[PDB]
């Protein structure tokens, strides 16, 4: 319901969608050749089929083609600075595909807006929907137009006859929350019966280890998940089932 929507919001009012408690199959995302730009930051594409996270955040918008390279950490640009920033330690996925067939009108489409001027930069994750006029001079505007005073928002104006430079592009970004809470989003892998007193290799919610399991009378805190006494090695685990 997110990769097939009829209409997408403007880049200045992007809407985020949260996804949790479901079994995901990312293969159909990377098997298909429809997408033009498919980038991953911090995680290999295939290995996503064997990982579990706590929640997934999806953001979607539409922008011109020449700026598809700007959506990346560390870059600077008008939309990158004034509309959508990225943290320097981002991990996730970025998908971008051409949508000239869905957002083009013969007379010109004027349903998309983008911000031109702003006093300062934004934080890595922020949203700006203020309609207050921007003042570049010294004389107060008093809510009216004038010299050195302009309306911030500006239109794009897509046309079907334009070249690849001005053609629209639909962009979605996926972010994961991990190493913070017990897993909620899972991958398709059927479980297996347990072993009590034998040395085996185990895979608990994506955490891979080797050794022998046992039952201990440890007063584990009910709201906690697992512990590590020292040397950054887990020793106590809780079975999800």
């Amino acid at each position, epitope marked *: 319901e997110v990769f097939n929507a009829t209409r997408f919001a403007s880049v200045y009012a992007w809407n985020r969608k949260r996804i949790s408690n479901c079994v995901a199959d990312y293969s159909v995302l990377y098997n298909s050749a429809s997408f033009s730009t498919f980038k991953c930051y911090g995680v290999s594409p295939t290995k996503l089929n064997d990982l579990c996270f706590t929640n997934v955040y999806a953001d979607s918008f539409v922008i011109r083609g020449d700026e598809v390279r700007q959506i990346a950490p560390g870059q600077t640009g008008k939309i990158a600075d004034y509309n959508y920033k990225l943290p320097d330690d981002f991990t996730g996925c970025v998908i971008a595909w051409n949508s000239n*067939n869905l957002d083009s009108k013969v007379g010109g489409n004027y349903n998309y807006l983008y911000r031109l001027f702003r006093k300062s930069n934004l934080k890595p994750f922020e949203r700006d929907i203020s309609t207050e006029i921007y003042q570049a001079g010294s004389t107060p505007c008093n809510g009216v137009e004038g010299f050195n005073c302009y309306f911030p928002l500006q239109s794009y104006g897509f046309q079907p006859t334009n070249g690849v430079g001005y053609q629209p592009y639909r962009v979605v970004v996926l972010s994961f929350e991990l190493l913070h809470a017990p897993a909620t989003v899972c991958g398709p892998k059927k479980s297996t019966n347990l072993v009590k007193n034998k040395c085996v290799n185990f895979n608990f919610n994506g955490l891979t280890g080797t050794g022998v399991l046992t039952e201990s009378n440890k007063k584990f805190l009910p709201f906690q998940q697992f512990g590590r006494d020292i040397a950054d090695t887990t020793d106590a685990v809780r079975d999800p089932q």
Partner: antibody
Amino acid sequence: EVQLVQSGAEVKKPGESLKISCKASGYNFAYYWIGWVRQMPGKGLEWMGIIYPGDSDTRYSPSFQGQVTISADKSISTAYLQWSSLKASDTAMYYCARGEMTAVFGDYWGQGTLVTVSS
Amino acid sequence: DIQMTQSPSSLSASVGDRVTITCQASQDISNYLNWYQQKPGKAPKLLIYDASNLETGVPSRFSGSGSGTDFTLTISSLQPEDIATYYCQQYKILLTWTFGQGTKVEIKR
């Protein structure tokens, strides 16, 4: 002033083949979506599929996938609709509609082709 | 999947009366609605292409409103030639969208 003209009403029998056409004039045929709608006597409507002739992109409703086929021809500015094997539950009225996917869809329709099947 | 409903199924009103019809949705659709009218034995015609925006070439006596899960269509002053069948169609996902059930409007004399 645009005009959509369909093909004549048809009668067939089970086990045969069929083809239906729809022609548009008065505008640039390569810049608008063409969709197909059906109505069975006495009941409501139900979309079947849509097609974009320029890039030649076809999309189908989940209920009617594989039982029909939709294609377009930009040389004569025409759209088609094809079957594989008819049965006793394919008699209906069909319309071809012109639309565009940002503001208005369903601006102009056709006449309505009537397809009958029996033995 | 999304299913819709209309109410009332059929109603009768006199000339010059005010008529209202309600379209209800299973879940949120965010003002993605279209209103269709079909006279007996003809092809449908567009009436309102959004929650409120009015199509060109339509008499001004028609109006529409609503949001969320409830939408209303109102006819202010009825006229003799306004006997037809009315439909409300939602369009959210790329191609799964469906019509309603239908409504019949009559006139007594």
